[PDB]
A paper describes a structure:
Voltage-gated sodium (Nav) channels govern membrane excitability in neurons and muscles. [name].7, encoded by [name] and primarily localized to the dorsal root ganglion neurons, has been explored as a prominent target for pain management. Here we report high-resolution cryo-EM structures of human [name].7 treated with drugs and lead compounds with representative chemical backbones at resolutions of 2.6-3.2 Å.
Unexpectedly, [name] has a second binding pose that directly plugs into the selectivity filter from the central cavity. The amide nitrogen from the central amide group of [name]-1 is H-bonded with the carboxyl group of Glu406 on S6I, and the carbonyl oxygen of CBZ receives an H-bond from Asn1461 on S6III. The two amides are H-bonded to the backbone carbonyl group of Thr1696 on the P1 loop of repeat IV, forming a stable anchor for [name]-2. The carbonyl oxygen from the acetylamino moiety interacts with Lys1406, which is one constituent of the DEKA motif on repeat III, and the amide nitrogen engages in an H-bond with Gln360, which is stabilized by the side chain hydroxyl group of Ser390. The extensive H-bond network may account for the stronger density of [name]-2 than that of [name]-1.
Residue numbers in the entry:
A (entry chain A): 8 to 34, 47 to 206, 209 to 418, 728 to 825, 831 to 1014, 1175 to 1768
B (entry chain C): 30 to 148
C (entry chain B): 20 to 192
Write the structure that this text describes.
């Protein structure tokens, strides 16, 4: 009640002391709604005028026994002070304490502190500040002291409860103040400034809500214990496997065969220091910082003639890429899990070891990279959903009127809206017609059309304003938006590219009639609406990391620049100033953290760079993922609440189309009226016999075998087939047999099903089309017209033969059914994304049309300095003199809107984006030689695009593809959509392995001894001891490295032998103790198997390293030791359930992987057909090309994850000289030319990386998130 | 390049004086490229006399005014390029100058030491 | 790219024949300067004889009634880096049956390093009067026809048996 409002007087303090005396004699819970930092319950109504900001008696009966008072702040917010005198000196009734409390609660105080923090943040971003900034620094320090002193005078320093030191953030404030004082009094400056960076964290304290957001983030990260344990364990196991396999393989190099002066390899190596010195003895590829890797196997890299492969020197990438030690192997496997630049590691390892080692990378990229990432996403999703449910539950608990009316009739009609929509679409399609190589008349017509459209829009605004007055005009967000767009367009007319491009935003007006374009606007609005605090936390964190990196590493980048750049100038990416530090942090968030980290370590030490980079990655990715999941779930759940009816007031477009259709029907009826006024018993059995035959299993299995045989026969048509003439002949004749068999099968299926039943079936249609192609090619070849252009090209369609297996295999049929059922929403979102990206493509065209041309030196490929050759005229004057000069242009640029689309795809996938960025930020003008970072602040264009078009689009896409699967599951009846009927039974039976109750204890034996052996074996002490022994064995495996001395090798061997005998001893004790009940437990029989394979592998390795010689087989056999450490999962309940989730999801992932492998096979055959003779460049080299089935499969697996697809596509975009040679002659073959086909290449790669995203990401995630919700019950 | 030297050095007559010249170049001190250029001037405006260099090995020019009392006490391998002098007389008083150039670095150092002889 | 295809071992009297000698490099991005010498040991002789030498885009056919005017270069053209070194007999006779050898002398150019290697490829040529049909072709055609016939008979037999059964049951009901 309002009478509870009474001042806190000395008598009240005495009474409260008496109450605490009563409490002591006595020797509950504070009201949650009455805690500090919250608003009063409304039962208290208003505050009396002479009461606000005064020490009022406590309003909580809980504190009635304790000395404590309350203050109230104009704004209905309660603070809970302490009635004890401050510092044993200042009483609560003292002028100092009164004024300090008033100040503290005043809102102007907090506003000033926030402004001070924001200004100090601006001052933090200065690599070298001017001398005079010490005055501003002292101003800031003094303001912080005043704030802290006011807080202390208001609520004591640490005298009891509710004191300055009690709140954690007050610790930070104190730490900042003492550090600021100590640095000045003492005056490594870098550490002092890096600690000065902590002031930015006070923003969380001052700005409301950020504290709760950070608490939520910490609670979220508290739930990832099991996932992080599993991730560390899996990365450790894979690191051990890789260390066993590839130890020292990356030190291989090609070394000169013929050595002068009777030199030796050791003598040479003891002297060389420079890369120039090294290049004289080892084989270096042109423009490479590392010696070419070679191998001793037949499928490894091949050294040139006169060079031999030798293991010596340092590992590539400054020495940071290796498996020589467990630490470096762990770094490599973490890089593989995050999939950052993993294709370089893939290629290096394959070159150094052998192409048969792609199995390691396949297993790692699926068992570790994707599955663990999806586990992390699923766990964060479950945390955010449980936090949302809690929040929802808590919330639940005179002459002018003539023209006004006339124009209101004219310009508010539905047809005006339809006309304006048509005009907007026409204007956008008209502005998408600009290109770098445009003529003067075309420029004129574009200008005229732009003027016409802007005039139309301005006239429409004027009319819609005079019809209805501004006081109502400006009441609509759409009206004010159109007003800003049109006024900016008029400003542009009176005065650029950017102002011209801002008109593009009118496209969003279609969101009213486009349901799935309103979803994107809702996502973007939530990012700054409900989740504004989360976005603000992200921005603050990124700013803090950028400043920290700058302060720590700028001087190092400036000084040790010759360790990372040959020219001794700052590289493209550095931390020497705030903009580049921010760019590095943003790139790390995008997912690229190793190439820049290498230079970081080179200049500024491994410990510092690793610590900072790991902190940045972990924290930034946690926050980014939290924001992503929050946006997704909010938009695709909270938005669904049936707030209002479906268009209760029909949209103007809807009304106009209704009128149009009514008029069309009226015209149709009138025209119809006007024109009417003006003027066998055996055949039936035969069909039965064919049906019985073609529905027989034997027949189905025979046809499946034939499909597999014909499918496989396509893999033998390499470039080397001319060396296998017998196989050539056999394959031609087998092709004829297959065509005959399939024609007969089609005829039988006709006679059996009927024409109607056969041709109302998509599988039958597909089979019929394939056999039609085969028959056409066979007939043409028989008639001898086997080389008539299009007929030759039609032979490439034989790559479609494998498609006949989809209808045969039930799992692939189920998965393709899911894809087919989800295809409409995919098309919807694809259209939305294309429209959204058209804006960015047009803006990029306007910014960068024709500015990527440069004059280069073709020998080195180095851009001529813009002092000489400033423009293309001078470049041509220079070519007329020299010979190896060229006015080249980037292959993927912004010359027109299609090339802009391709460039944006590369930027959004983060593959090849760096080349485009470099060209863009160098771009000067059209027909002008680029300069270094002349247009430096063009990086913002790519930053904004990556944010919007590559984060929000990915929000929308994932959100809609996951509903279309939830809707499919609900429609089927709560049934798994990726699992077959025969797999459903196995899945149901398997679900009971995660819920069986414990069995009865195994009976004690009879003997006194065996019985004593029983008690031990059945003890938690025994179990823990065995676990510790397993851990020690794993440590002994880790300690091994490359180049270790023979003494260490022997001592490690003996330690492992002792471990083996100990584990065998414990197994034998268990056996004799449990008798025959030992094998009733799966973990027991797993341990028995592991023991047996351990013993056998030890003996086999001993034999192979003695009686035989085979290092590869020795290394592979030594991998039996991993089974000893795989037993740690037995006791770890946290990760056992996650692995159970994996084993539950295996059946569906099998079907998905089967379909993916079929798609990869088809694409590999097409690649062998097309790109087998393209020029060796970029990602196409002697070892990764499309010249063979193995090479093609390696490349396709590489780009299944969207890694290096830009590099693989680059050689295929060559189509005319001097890029390619159309009349090149290939020895040993009749094919001519090494040019590529730009259109076929673009379609091939884009479609592949698209089919890739709809299976590796949308379907794999869907399945793993589906089974994680089951395991967790 | 950063060079750390004392502005003024005071030593007693007849005592051995060590001139502290040091640098902290980021790169390793390749002895095959390191360059030294120690010089002496009785005054700032006075001319400078070469008396101790380092091209590939420590070379002392043994000027008459210093006799054989000037030697090298530090080591590039460890970023100390100090100079050691015996029994300072009342004439060595003046200004000492180390000039350093450690490739692949480009900035050229300059360490100046003022030696003073006390009673 | 470069594929080391072997040569045929059968020329028909009175017609043309091309003798293949392709020798590719281990790494195709290297530079080299190749030349070749062909030798021939006629069926009925014991000594290998030099017949021609091709260096710097000029063929020097050593005097030899047998090959005079009956050989022309047919390998890689317009370069000093020869990876295909095939010759072409424009009019086969019976004096062209024997053992051919194709010596390749390649000189790789590296960075502060020159390597001079060598390759030898032997081609045995027998001259006939009528082009024999490939045994592989003959066997494959025979097997194709046999398999087609076998599959057709099996299908028709199954057809007839199933029809008799189905009609029998239909009449029974
Ligand atoms: C929230 C915050 C989360 C992150 C917290 C911090 C996390 C980890 C600490 C990282 C730093 C630890 C090591 C410090 C540096 C150090 O003391 O380095 C010792 C050795 C040096 O070796 P070296 O002499 O051969 O180096 C030269 C080799 N040469 C000659 C070929 C160039 O370091 C090596 O070897 C390798 C050093 C790197 C080891 C792999 C680390 C992988 C971490 C993954 C994160 C997982 C989550
Ligand atoms: C490289 C290093 C070398 C590796 C060496 C290890 C090689 C593999 C060892 C053998 C695997 C043993 C499989 C377990 C069979 C256990 C069994 O008989 O049951 C089938 C199990 C479920 O076991 P359960 O506990 O319900 O068995 C009844 C026991 N009771 C009553 C206590 C609940 O099914 C399952 O998950 C089994 C599926 C897991 C398959 C193995 C995983 C590794 C791949
Ligand atoms: O259902 C389609 C129906 C019936 O077909 P059925 O195989 O007799 O049905 C078997 C079933 N057990 C039953 O109850 O009875 O059958 C129909 O209702 C068929 C309706 C469409 C007409 C089909 C005519 C074409 C038949 C096939 C023509 C083959 C032409 C020649 C091919 C090449 C020959 C060399
Ligand atoms: C690091 C990566 C390496 C792969 C994982 C580690 C390899 C070892 C896997 C263990 C194989 C032996 C299992 C022995 C049979 C035990 C068994 O029941 O299996 C299945 C068990 C289920 O455990 P539970 O005690 O019944 O119930 C707890 C759960 N809930 O559930 C499990 O323990 C999960 C078994 C599946 C393992 C993953 C298979 C995919 C490959
Ligand atoms: C601005 C320029 C660049 C547009 C270029 C593309 C247009 C020629 C087409 C292609 C896709 C079309 C859109 C595809 C789908 C729709 C949804 C359609 O409404 C529904 O489908 C409603 C469904 C429901 O209410 O259930 C209204 C037209 C619209 C926005 C279309 C408007 C015209 C678009 C943009
Ligand atoms: C590729 C070019 C050279 C061939 C022509 C295009 C085909 C891809 C089209 C032509 C006819 C189409 C078919 C026409 C009829 C049908 C039956 C249709 O289902 C029904 O009509 C059955 C009854 C029902 O679904 O209610 C399913 C699609 C399908 C196979 C269509 C799939 C697409 C086909 C094969
Ligand atoms: C919706 C749009 C606004 C977001 C995505 C694109 C923007 C971030 C772009 C559009 C226009 C761009 C500006 C256009 C022109 C320039 C000039 C350029 O500098 C120079 O031309 C160098 C001048 C000199 O050195 O003489 C640096 C980038 C900057 C400021 C650009 C900054 C990034 C802007 C604002
Ligand atoms: C589910 C769909 C499954 C589709 C399977 C299609 C057939 C899948 C057939 O797979 C095996 C072939 O690809 C082998 O081709 P190779 O060219 O490697 O064989 C010869 C290799 N050497 C000897 C020249 C080196
Ligand atoms: C260059 C040329 C490129 C050509 C690409 C061709 C792609 C073809 C993809 C395979 C396309 C094959 O058809 C897909 C099927 O899903 C369509 O038939 P349904 O499965 O929907 O039929 C009903 C099935 N149930 C529900 C009764 C089981
Ligand atoms: C992406 C990774 C792909 C590989 C994942 C590992 C899968 C490897 C594990 O396969 C698990 C199987 O149970 C699923 O395939 P099946 O169809 O054989 O199972 C049911 C058996 N019947 C009833 C059909 C015979
Ligand atoms: C789905 C997972 C990803 C696809 C996996 C496909 C199966 C795995 C396909 O692996 C193909 C590689 O093994 C080819 O390299 P090789 O070293 O075997 O080639 C040897 C060639 N010679 C020397 C014999 C001529
Ligand atoms: C952990 O991220 C892996 C990341 N792959 C790389 C190399 O960055 C990915 O999501 N690939 C899935 C994918 C597939 C196709 C097109 C785009 C993305």
């Amino acid at each position: 009640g309002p009478q509870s409002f009474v001042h806190f007087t000395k008598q009240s303090l005495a009474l409260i002391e008496q109450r605490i005396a009563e409490r002591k004699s006595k020797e509950p819970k504070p009201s949650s709604d009455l805690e500090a930092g919250k608003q009063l319950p409304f039962i208290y109504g208003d505050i009396p005028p002479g009461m606000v900001s005064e020490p009022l008696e406590d309003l909580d009966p809980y504190y009635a026994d304790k000395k404590t008072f309350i203050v109230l702040n104009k704004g209905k917010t309660i603070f809970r002070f302490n009635a004890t005198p401050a510092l044993y000196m200042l009483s609560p009734f003292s002028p100092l304490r009164r004024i300090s409390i008033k100040i503290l609660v005043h809102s102007l105080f907090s506003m000033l502190i926030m402004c001070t923090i924001l200004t100090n943040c601006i001052f933090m971003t200065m690599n070298n500040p001017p001398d005079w900034t010490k005055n501003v620094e002292y101003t800031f320090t003094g303001i912080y002291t005043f704030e802290s002193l006011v807080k202390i005078l208001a609520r004591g320093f640490c005298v009891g409860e509710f004191t300055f030191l009690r709140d954690p953030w007050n610790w930070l404030d104190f730490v900042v103040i003492v550090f600021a004082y100590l640095t000045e009094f003492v005056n490594n400056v870098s550490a002092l400034r890096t600690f000065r960076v902590l002031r930015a964290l006070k923003t969380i304290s001052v700005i409301p809500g950020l504290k709760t957001i950070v608490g939520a983030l910490i609670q979220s990260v508290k739930k990832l214990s099991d996932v992080m344990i599993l991730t560390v364990f899996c990365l450790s196991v894979f690191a051990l496997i890789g260390l066993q396999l590839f130890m020292g393989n990356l030190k291989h190099k090609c070394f000169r065969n013929s050595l002068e002066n009777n030199e030796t390899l050791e003598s040479i190596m003891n002297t060389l220091e420079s890369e120039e010195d090294f290049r004289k003895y080892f084989y270096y590829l042109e423009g490479s910082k590392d010696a070419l890797l070679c191998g001793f196997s037949t499928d490894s890299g091949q050294c040139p003639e006169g060079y031999t492969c030798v293991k010596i020197g340092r590992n590539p990438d400054y020495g940071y890429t290796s498996f020589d030690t467990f630490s470096w192997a762990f770094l490599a496997l973490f890089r593989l899990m995050t999939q950052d630049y993993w294709e370089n590691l893939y290629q290096q390892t394959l070159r150094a070891a052998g192409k048969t080692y792609m199995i390691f990378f396949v297993v790692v990229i699926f068992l570790g990279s994707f599955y663990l990432i999806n586990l992390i996403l699923a766990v964060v999703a479950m945390a955010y959903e449980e936090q949302n449910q809690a929040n929802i539950e808590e919330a639940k608990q005179p002459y002018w009127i003539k023209f006004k009316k006339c124009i209101y009739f004219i310009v508010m009609d539905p047809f005006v809206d339809l006309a304006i929509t048509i005009c907007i679409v026409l204007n956008t399609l008209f502005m998408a017609m600009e290109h770098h190589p445009m003529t003067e008349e075309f420029k004129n017509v574009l200008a005229i059309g732009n003027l016409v459209f802007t005039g139309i829009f301005a006239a429409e605004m004027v009319l819609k304003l005079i019809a209805m007055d501004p006081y109502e005009y400006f009441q609509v967000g759409w009206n004010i938006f159109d007003s800003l767009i049109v006024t900016l367009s008029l400003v542009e007319l009176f005065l650029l590219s950017v102002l011209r491009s801002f008109r593009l935003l009118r496209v969003f007006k279609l969101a009213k009639s486009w349901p799935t374009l309103n979803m994107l606007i809702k996502i973007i609005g939530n990012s700054v609406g409900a989740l504004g605090n989360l976005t603000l936390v992200l921005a603050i964190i990124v700013f803090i990391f950028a400043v920290v990196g700058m302060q720590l590493f700028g001087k190092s980048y400036k000084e040790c620049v010759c360790k990372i750049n040959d020219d001794c100038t700052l590289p493209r990416w550095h931390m020497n100033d705030f903009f580049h530090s921010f760019l590095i942090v943003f790139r790390v968030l995008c997912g690229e953290w190793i190439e820049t980290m290498w230079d970081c370590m080179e200049v500024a030490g491994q410990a510092m760079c690793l610590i900072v980079y790991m902190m940045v990655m972990v924290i930034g990715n946690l926050v980014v993922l939290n924001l992503f999941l929050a946006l997704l779930l909010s938009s695709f759940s909270s938005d669904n609440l049936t707030a209002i009816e479906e268009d209760p007031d029909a949209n103007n477009l809807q009304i106009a189309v209704t009128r149009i259709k009514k008029g069309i029907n009226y015209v149709k009826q009138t025209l119809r009226e006007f024109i009417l006024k003006a003027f066998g018993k055996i055949w039936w059995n035969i069909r039965k016999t064919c049906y019985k035959i073609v529905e027989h299993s034997w027949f189905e299995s025979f046809i499946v075998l034939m499909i597999l045989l014909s499918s496989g026969a396509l893999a033998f048509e390499d470039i080397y087939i001319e060396r296998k003439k017998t196989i050539k002949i056999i394959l031609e004749y087998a092709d004829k047999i297959f065509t005959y068999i399939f024609i007969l099968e089609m005829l039988l299926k006709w006679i059996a099903y009927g024409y109607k039943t056969y041709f109302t079936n998509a599988w039958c249609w597909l089979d019929f089309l394939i056999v039609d192609v085969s028959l056409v090619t066979l007939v043409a070849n028989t008639l001898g017209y086997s080389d008539l252009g299009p007929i030759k090209s039609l032979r490439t369609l034989r790559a479609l033969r494998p498609l006949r297996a989809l209808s045969r295999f039930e799992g692939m049929r189920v998965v393709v059914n899911a894809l087919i059922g989800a295809i409409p929403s995919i098309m919807n979102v694809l259209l939305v994304c294309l429209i959204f990206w058209l804006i960015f493509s047009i803006m990029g065209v306007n910014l960068f049309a024709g500015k990527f041309y440069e004059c280069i030196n073709t020998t080195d490929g180095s851009r001529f300095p813009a002092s000489q050759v400033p423009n293309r005229s001078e470049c041509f004057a220079l070519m007329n003199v020299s010979q190896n000069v060229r006015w080249k242009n980037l292959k993927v640029n912004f010359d027109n809107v299609g090339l802009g689309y391709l460039s944006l795809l590369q930027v959004a996938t983060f593959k090849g984006w760096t080349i485009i960025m470099y060209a863009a930020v160098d771009s000067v003008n059209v027909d002008k030689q680029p300069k270094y970072e002349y247009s430096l602040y063009m990086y913002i264009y790519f930053v904004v695009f990556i944010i919007f078009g590559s984060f929000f689009t990915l929000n929308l896409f994932i959100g809609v593809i996951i509903d279309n699967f939830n809707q499919q599951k609900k429609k089927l009846g709560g049934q798994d959509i990726f699992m077959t009927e025969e797999q459903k039974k196995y899945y149901n039976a398997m679900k009971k392995l995660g819920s069986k109750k414990p069995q009865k204890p195994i009976p004690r034996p009879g003997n006194k001894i065996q019985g004593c052996i029983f008690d031990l074996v059945t003890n938690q002490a025994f179990d823990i001891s065995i676990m510790v022994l397993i851990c020690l064995n794993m440590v002994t495996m880790m300690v091994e490295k490359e180049g270790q001395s023979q003494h260490m090798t022997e001592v490690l061997y003996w330690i492992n032998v002792v471990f083996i005998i100990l584990f065998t001893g414990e197994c034998v004790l268990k056996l004799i103790s449990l008798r025959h009940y030992y094998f009733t437990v799966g973990w027991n029989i797993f341990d028995f198997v592991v023991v047996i394979i351990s013993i056998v592998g030890m003996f086999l390795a001993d034999l192979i390293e003695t009686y035989f010689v085979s290092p590869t087989l020795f290394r592979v056999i030594r991998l039996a030791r991993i089974g000893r450490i795989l037993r740690l999962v037995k006791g770890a309940k946290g990760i056992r359930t996650l692995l159970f989730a994996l084993m539950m999801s295996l059946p569906a992932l099998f079907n998905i992987g089967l379909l993916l492998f079929l798609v990869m096979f088809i694409y590999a055959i097409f690649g062998m057909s097309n790109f087998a003779y393209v020029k060796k460049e970029d990602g196409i080299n002697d070892m990764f090309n499309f010249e063979t089935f193995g090479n093609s499969m390696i490349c396709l697996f590489q780009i299944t994850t969207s890694a290096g697809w830009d590099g693989l596509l680059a050689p295929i975009l060559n189509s005319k000289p001097p890029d390619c040679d159309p009349k090149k002659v290939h020895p040993g073959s009749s094919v001519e030319g090494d040019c590529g086909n730009p259109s076929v290449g673009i379609f091939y790669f884009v479609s592949y990386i698209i089919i890739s995203f709809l299976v590796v990401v949308n379907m794999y995630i869907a399945v793993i998130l589906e089974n994680f919700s089951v395991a967790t019950e | 390049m950063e060079v750390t030297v004392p502005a003024t050095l005071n030593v007693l007559n007849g005592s051995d004086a060590r001139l502290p010249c040091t640098f902290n170049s980021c790169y390793t001190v390749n002895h095959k490229q390191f360059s030294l250029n120690w010089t002496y001037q009785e005054c700032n405006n006075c001319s400078e006399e070469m008396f101790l260099q380092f091209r590939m090995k420590i070379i002392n020019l043994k000027l008459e005014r210093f006799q054989d009392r000037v030697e090298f006490s530090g080591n590039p391998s460890k970023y100390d390029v100090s100079v050691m002098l015996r029994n300072v007389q009342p004439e060595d008083e003046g200004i000492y100058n180390c000039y350093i150039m450690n490739p692949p670095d480009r900035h050229r150092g300059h360490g100046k030491i003022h030696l003073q002889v006390l009673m | 790219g470069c594929v080391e295809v072997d040569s045929e071992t059968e020329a028909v009297y009175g017609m043309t024949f091309k003798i293949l000698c392709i020798s590719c490099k281990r790494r195709s991005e290297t530079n080299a300067e190749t030349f070749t010498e062909w030798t021939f040991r006629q069926k009925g002789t014991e000594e290998f004889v030099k017949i021609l030498r091709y260096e710097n885009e000029v063929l020097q056919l050593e005097e030899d009634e047998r090959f005079e005017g009956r050989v022309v270069w047919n390998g890689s053209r317009g370069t000093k880096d020869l990876q295909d070194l095939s010759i072409f007999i424009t009019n086969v006779t019976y004096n062209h049956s024997g053992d051919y050898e194709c010596h390749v002398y390649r000189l790789l150019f590296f960075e502060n390093y020159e390597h001079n290697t060598s390759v030898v490829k032997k081609i045995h040529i027998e001259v006939v009067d009528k082009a024999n049909r490939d045994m592989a072709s003959i066997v494959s055609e025979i097997m194709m026809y046999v398999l087609i016939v076998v599959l057709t008979i099996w299908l028709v037999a199954e057809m007839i048996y199933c029809y008799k059964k189905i009609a029998a049951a239909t009449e029974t009901a």
